[PDB]
Design a protein around this ligand. Structure first.
Ligand SMILES: [Zn+2]
Ligand SMILES: [Zn+2]
Lengths: 58, 7
């Protein structure tokens, strides 16, 4: 699994136990609060199996 | 979508 000091997202910062979502087009991980996805939306997207497309990829 | 939720 990845090390705790790996970098992600548009912000180039670690996971830090923050809510994150993976882009199905570029495979990068994004902090929800960086890209506009609430935890609640994340819960729904995870359960409904729908793709997430990040801002870079839009 | 794949997510990580605060643990
Ligand atoms: Zn971020
Ligand atoms: Zn993307």
């Amino acid at each position: 699994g990845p090390l705790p000091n790996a970098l992600y997202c548009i912000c180039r910062q670690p996971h830090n136990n923050r809510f994150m979502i993976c882009c199905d087009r570029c495979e990068e991980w994004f902090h929800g609060d960086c890209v506009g996805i609430s935890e609640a939306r994340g819960r729904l997207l995870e359960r409904n199996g729908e793709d997430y497309i990040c801002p870079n990829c839009t | 979508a794949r997510t990580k939720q605060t643990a």
